[PDB]
Amino acid sequence: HMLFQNVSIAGLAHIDAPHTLTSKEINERLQPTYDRLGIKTDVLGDVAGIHARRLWDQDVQASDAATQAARKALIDANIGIEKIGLLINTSVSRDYLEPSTASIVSGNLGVSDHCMTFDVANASLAFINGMDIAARMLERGEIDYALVVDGETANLVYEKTLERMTSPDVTEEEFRNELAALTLGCGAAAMVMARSELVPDAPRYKGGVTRSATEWNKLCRGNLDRMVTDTRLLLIEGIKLAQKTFVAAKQVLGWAVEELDQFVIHQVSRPHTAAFVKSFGIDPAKVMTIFGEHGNIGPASVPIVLSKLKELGRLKKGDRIALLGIGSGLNCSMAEVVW
Amino acid sequence: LFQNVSIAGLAHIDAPHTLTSKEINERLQPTYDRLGIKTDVLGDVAGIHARRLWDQDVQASDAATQAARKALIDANIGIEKIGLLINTSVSRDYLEPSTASIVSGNLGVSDHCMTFDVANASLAFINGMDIAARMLERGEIDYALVVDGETANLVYEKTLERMTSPDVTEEEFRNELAALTLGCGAAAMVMARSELVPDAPRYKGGVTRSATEWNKLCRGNLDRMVTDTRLLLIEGIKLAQKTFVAAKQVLGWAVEELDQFVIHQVSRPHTAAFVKSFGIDPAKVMTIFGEHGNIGPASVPIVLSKLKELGRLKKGDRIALLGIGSGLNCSMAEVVW
Ligand SMILES: CCCCCCCCCCCCCC(=O)SCCNC(=O)CCNC(=O)[C@H](O)C(C)(C)COP(=O)(O)OP(=O)(O)OC[C@H]1O[C@@H](n2cnc3c(N)ncnc32)[C@H](O)[C@@H]1OP(=O)(O)O
Ligand SMILES: CCCCCCCCCCCCCC(=O)O
Numbered sequence A: 001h002m003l004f005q006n007v008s009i010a011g012l013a014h015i016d017a018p019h020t021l022t023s024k025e026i027n028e029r030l031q032p033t034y035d036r037l038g039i040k041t042d043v044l045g046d047v048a049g050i051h052a053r054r055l056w057d058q059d060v061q062a063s064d065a066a067t068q069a070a071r072k073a074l075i076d077a078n079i080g081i082e083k084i085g086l087l088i089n090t091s092v093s094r095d096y097l098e099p100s101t102a103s104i105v106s107g108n109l110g111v112s113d114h115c116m117t118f119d120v121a122n123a124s125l126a127f128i129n130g131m132d133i134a135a136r137m138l139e140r141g142e143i144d145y146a147l148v149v150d151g152e153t154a155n156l157v158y159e160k161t162l163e164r165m166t167s168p169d170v171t172e173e174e175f176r177n178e179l180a181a182l183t184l185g186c187g188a189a190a191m192v193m194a195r196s197e198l199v200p201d202a203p204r205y206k207g208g209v210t211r212s213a214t215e216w217n218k219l220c221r222g223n224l225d226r227m228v229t230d231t232r233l234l235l236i237e238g239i240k241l242a243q244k245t246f247v248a249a250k251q252v253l254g255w256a257v258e259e260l261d262q263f264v265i266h267q268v269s270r271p272h273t274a275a276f277v278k279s280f281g282i283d284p285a286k287v288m289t290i291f292g293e294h295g296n297i298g299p300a301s302v303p304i305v306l307s308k309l310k311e312l313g314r315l316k317k318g319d320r321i322a323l324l325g326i327g328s329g330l331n332c333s334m335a336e337v338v339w
Numbered sequence B: 001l002f003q004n005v006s007i008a009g010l011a012h013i014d015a016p017h018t019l020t021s022k023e024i025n026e027r028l029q030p031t032y033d034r035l036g037i038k039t040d041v042l043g044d045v046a047g048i049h050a051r052r053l054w055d056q057d058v059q060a061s062d063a064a065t066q067a068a069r070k071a072l073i074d075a076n077i078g079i080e081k082i083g084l085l086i087n088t089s090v091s092r093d094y095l096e097p098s099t100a101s102i103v104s105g106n107l108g109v110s111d112h113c114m115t116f117d118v119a120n121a122s123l124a125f126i127n128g129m130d131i132a133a134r135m136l137e138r139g140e141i142d143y144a145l146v147v148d149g150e151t152a153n154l155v156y157e158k159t160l161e162r163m164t165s166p167d168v169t170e171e172e173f174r175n176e177l178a179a180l181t182l183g184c185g186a187a188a189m190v191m192a193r194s195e196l197v198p199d200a201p202r203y204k205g206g207v208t209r210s211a212t213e214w215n216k217l218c219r220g221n222l223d224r225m226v227t228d229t230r231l232l233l234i235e236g237i238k239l240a241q242k243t244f245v246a247a248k249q250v251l252g253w254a255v256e257e258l259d260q261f262v263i264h265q266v267s268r269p270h271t272a273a274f275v276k277s278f279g280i281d282p283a284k285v286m287t288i289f290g291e292h293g294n295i296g297p298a299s300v301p302i303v304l305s306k307l308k309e310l311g312r313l314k315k316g317d318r319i320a321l322l323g324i325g326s327g328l329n330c331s332m333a334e335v336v337w
Helices: A023-037 A043-048 A062-076 A101-109 A126-140 A155-165 A172-183 A231-252 A270-280 A298-311 B021-035 B041-046 B060-075 B099-107 B124-138 B153-164 B170-181 B229-250 B268-277 B296-310
Strands: A007-016 A019-022 A052-055 A084-089 A116-121 A145-152 A187-195 A204-212 A220-223 A226-229 A262-265 A320-327 A331-338 B005-014 B017-020 B050-053 B082-087 B114-119 B143-150 B185-193 B202-210 B218-221 B224-227 B260-263 B318-325 B329-336
Touching: A007 A062, A007 A126, A007 A298, A019 A023, A023 A043, A023 A155, A023 A172, A043 A172, A043 A270, A062 A084, A062 A101, A062 A145, A062 A187, A084 A101, A084 A126, A101 A116, A101 A145, A116 A126, A116 B202, A116 B329, A126 A145, A126 A187, A126 A204, A126 A298, A126 A320, A126 A331, A126 B124, A145 A298, A155 A172, A155 A226, A172 A226, A187 A298, A204 A231, A204 B114, A231 A270, A231 A320, A231 A331, A262 A298, A298 A320, B005 B060, B005 B124, B005 B296, B017 B021, B021 B041, B021 B153, B021 B170, B041 B170, B041 B268, B060 B082, B060 B099, B060 B143, B060 B185, B082 B099, B082 B124, B099 B114, B099 B143, B114 B124, B124 B143, B124 B185, B124 B202, B124 B296, B124 B318, B124 B329, B143 B296, B153 B170, B153 B224, B170 B224, B170 B229, B185 B296, B202 B229, B229 B268, B229 B318, B229 B329, B260 B268, B260 B296, B296 B318
Parallel strands: A084 A116, A084 A145, A262 A320, B082 B114, B082 B143, B260 B318
Antiparallel strands: A007 A187, A007 A204, A019 A052, A116 B114, A145 A187, A204 A331, A220 A226, A320 A331, B005 B185, B005 B202, B017 B050, B143 B185, B202 B329, B218 B224, B318 B329
């Protein structure tokens, strides 16, 4: 069913950004605005369910964060950069409109003049898009190894959003529109993929399915210093698209929820995740969450969670792992890894 | 090499307003005299006499959508046949969502349609073609759209502001001069499985080489681009030369056996230096930078579209696509008409 054959995960790593910014600290700054607007509940901690997120230093570029994750992934795969035939950067954050962030990461790492490099961008689903693009090359044997890399920077969005929200003249509409920006987090991930013949004991990536609802492309719009979001509609329409995607997953992947061992789900908030889980009858014990302390790390979130599961010893040979995400667009992808 | 991939349709959009270099020079003149500049670098050296700008508030997605509708017409298919849409432009108005999702919503793609952006300076359209080719070959989709709209209005407005500020120095001038060689435009291409379109040109793919140590040489956002023009020409030509040598082995290329060269459009001296390297007949190399400037990753398919519309290509004609982009990355591929 066009599922990938002989494509494996040779190496995986994540980077947690070092600086903790608490929702309590945020609420401190926003309190005069809350009081003016008559907001009496903690919409960050109690409603969204986010208690903290991580930020980098101000001088860290997306390419820097991605470079860090990539070096750690190369070590996990026990290979040198000279073996990499393809490097794709999947992040929402970017250094410049041009050149690609991939070219910057590739120069930092010292790839060879045979290495193919470029960025893919697609909100929170891009890492999975990157894995599929690499998989198609690896399956046909065009390359032996690929790197998929992703660094996210939320520093500037916090800095400018907080300034706008605490201005004496901010409107209730603008405040509500920008609030979800304060659920984002910094972080990075990278994966080394390989032809299975080279790594017979490595986990296998099978791919999976994708569905879209691009008529909803206005729901969440972001730039370096601003994100505007219709949270209510994003939930309702996101969930509808996921159910459609699940029907497809059952068809091509043969999925039955009680037969899956882990669900690695992109997270936009605690209620969004709860609605998702309840929708498909998923065992909550099978769903790791880092949103509470890391917020939403965009397209890095899924591979960060998978890396964290690996490091926690939660994954064992033969485990069936579902990668699931809804991304601004809207887009929804569901794929399988067999550990 | 790709065996079962074809180009079902192709289209370009020329932007409607002309900004001549003569007119730029009139604005720049007091800066020129204050700095003792006696040369017309744009006109006499770069050989860019004009470029096109959009009406105000045309966004990248708008330009790309215009081109896509035209390319669907050229392919004789409705949007419901498209299983994949990739946007490859440098211009974008948001980091999220993809500019592809916005174009896709404009066009009304189906809920089965996979969409996303590829970014790779001026090489991204060829990258997007190759990504679509692999999906077509593998049987995942029947038809793909690759789209690209570029918006240079802002970069011109802000760059001309800076170059006329009374403080401006000659080094600042030289550092931003390359931004005055850019232009607006758009292109889109429909790719398909060959069994569906037997008379259509075949896309064979090609080879890719990189020189990623040179990533600092040209850096740009919507309002500003800085460029080391001298080193970029020298290193860009080195990499183009290496990739062309590689193309000679794996594609079997010999210069006298290719009918058209479709080159990324950078400047007269860039172009001249490449074709002299390999003794390429300049008559086999269509150029539009003279009046359109550098339209980034859309430059190559805009040229290909213009050749198609000129209507003088014939079946069996071997067409070399020579793409390159700030990075540096280079890719060369073959279409057989
Ligand atoms: C970023 C997003 C924006 C929005 C989207 C946009 C579109 C899509 C995106 C596209 C993405 C874009 C991505 C990209 O990558 S675009 C980057 C590649 N493009 C360019 O570099 C632009 C064109 N550059 C050239 O054509 C050549 O380098 C020039 C013509 C400059 C020199 O060529 P050449 O080597 O043959 O000339 P020469 O050395 O013998 O000098 C002769 C004369 O010229 C004078 N001179 C030389 N250099 C400069 C200078 N820098 N400033 C001022 N003057 C200069 C010099 O003083 C001398 O004068 P005179 O003494 O004899 O008095
Ligand atoms: C294969 C193209 C041959 C033309 C020679 C161009 C010289 C290299 C300069 C490349 C500059 C980057 C171009 C871009 O991203 O717009």
